[PDB]
């Protein structure tokens, strides 16, 4: 794992063909302390993350990692919070701009490819640093059904059956692949995402400790779940 010149300071190749500054941006995602899970069902797509509000002095409704990009597209950001807000503003811009030029709402994959391409620029130009954050987008495609996409500070992007980001990403993915190996209803999809975050963080959740976001084939508008709606899922999982 060698270094030569300014390969650990700027986005220029290392002797092994690596981009150390991009590698460091992945470590910045974990600096936030949070973990996020996203699962794709038969007729739905859910996103879930931790909701750490340590002082009662905060206004709990302003503390969020879930965002509405468009009416039918939502996202869960993981990493450096301001870097995350910046990416959400750009995602919103690119999406509104797309409908303006093309007369149709941006596909989930196109918005993910777009944000990923913007992120790649930072990976090639030295005068700026990558964003220390991970974006996961959900939405219902008119012809392809539910979609779950994620993009990296590296500029990579992909579609997923289920995905994770943050501190316990490795463990969350290990868990998510074990359940997908062994029918994905809306309840089955919500319960899986909640119990992935819970078993991986070893925390039996309270309704204020997590935030759930969902898109449904019946109602494709990105919906963020209430504490009561979150509790109805939490209690039904405990019944089992």
């Amino acid at each position: 794992g060698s270094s030569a010149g300014f390969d650990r300071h700027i986005t220029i190749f290392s002797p092994e063909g690596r981009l150390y500054q991009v590698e460091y941006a992945f470590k910045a995602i974990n600096q936030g302390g949070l973990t996020s899970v996203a699962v794709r069902g038969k007729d739905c797509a859910v996103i879930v993350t931790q909701k750490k509000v340590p002082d009662k002095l905060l206004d709990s409704s302003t503390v969020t990692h879930l965002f509405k990009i468009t009416e039918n597209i939502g996202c869960v950001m993981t990493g450096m919070t301001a870097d995350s807000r910046s990416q959400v503003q750009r995602a919103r811009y690119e999406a509104a701009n797309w409908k303006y030029k093309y007369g149709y709402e941006i596909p989930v994959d196109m918005l993910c490819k777009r944000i990923a391409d913007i992120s790649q620029v930072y990976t090639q130009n030295a005068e700026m640093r990558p964003l220390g954050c991970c974006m996961i987008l959900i939405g219902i495609d008119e012809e392809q059904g539910p979609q779950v996409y994620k993009c990296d500070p590296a500029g990579y992007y992909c579609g997923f059956k289920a995905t994770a980001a943050g501190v316990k990403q490795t463990e969350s993915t290990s868990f998510l692949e074990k359940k997908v190996k062994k029918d994905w209803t809306f309840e089955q999809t919500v319960e899986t995402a909640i119990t992935c975050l819970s078993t991986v963080l070893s925390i039996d959740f309270k309704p204020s400790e997590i935030e759930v976001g969902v898109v449904t084939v019946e109602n494709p508008k990105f919906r963020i779940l209430t504490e009561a709606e979150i509790d109805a899922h939490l209690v039904a999982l405990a019944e089992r």
Binding site: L57, S61, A82
Partner: protein, 243 residues
């Protein structure tokens, strides 16, 4: 502080995924005089421990409270010239909203816009992050009372109570004692002064001057300074409580 080149630019991450230039800029706020803001049932109130650097200065020099818009107020902590440059940005942001949409900029929206001008200075070797943290307060019938805070990183959160500076944590454990959600701006002013006097270090620091401002139903949603009458009454209670 990792002194190996990884901390000289905001376009450079350290191996553990940190941007030290932003952290060093946050340390300028950590060395600053404390500013506090409290959101209550009918408005938002600001109070600042404005340390008196010289007996030669005028009463009210170096105001750490600004009017960003007719309904928005700003309480700063950190490098004052950066703080005042952010006041001008926020002012122009509010001015541009009215020119675009014909009505007063919603506080959450102003906080979001200004926090992204702050964020922008945390990505490049070409520019320096702002060595400043600030709060925005507002009150309207439609939106209610709103208090937000932005840090050198560009993060913007909504608050019921907030403190920034040297005594950031000490002020917070005192603000936590108050049940603001059920209080008025006439009652909460007395408490803001009490908290600022408690948090002040008479030994390590020299004399200080208390700056008090508010925006609420009592002011018709306009950001104003607390009149001399009410300020003297709150300072009298703050000194009497200390004993």
């Amino acid at each position: 502080s990792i002194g190996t080149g990884y901390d000289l630019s905001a376009s450079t991450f350290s191996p553990d995924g940190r941007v030290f230039q932003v952290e060093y800029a946050m340390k300028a706020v950590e060395n600053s005089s404390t500013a506090i803001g409290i959101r209550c049932k009918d408005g938002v109130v600001f109070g600042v421990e404005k340390l008196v650097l010289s007996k030669l200065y005028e009463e009210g020099s170096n105001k750490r409270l600004f009017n960003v818009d007719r309904h928005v107020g700003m309480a700063v902590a950190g490098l004052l010239a950066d703080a005042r440059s952010l006041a001008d940005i926020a002012r122009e942001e509010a001015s541009n909203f009215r020119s675009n949409f014909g009505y007063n900029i919603p506080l959450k929206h102003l906080a979001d816009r200004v926090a992204m001008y702050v964020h922008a200075y945390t990505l490049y070797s070409a520019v320096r992050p702002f060595g400043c943290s600030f709060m925005l307060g507002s009150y309207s019938v439609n939106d209610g009372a709103q208090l937000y805070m932005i840090d050198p990183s560009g993060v913007s959160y909504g608050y019921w109570g907030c403190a920034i500076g040297k005594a950031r944590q000490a002020a917070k454990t005192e603000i936590e004692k108050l049940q603001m959600k059920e209080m008025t701006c006439r009652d909460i002013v007395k408490e803001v002064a009490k908290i600022i006097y408690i948090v002040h270090d008479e030994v390590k620091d020299k004399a200080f001057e208390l700056e008090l401002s508010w925006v609420g139903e009592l002011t018709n949603g306009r950001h104003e300074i607390v009149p001399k009458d009410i300020r003297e009454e709150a300072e009298k209670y703050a000194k009497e409580s200390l004993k």
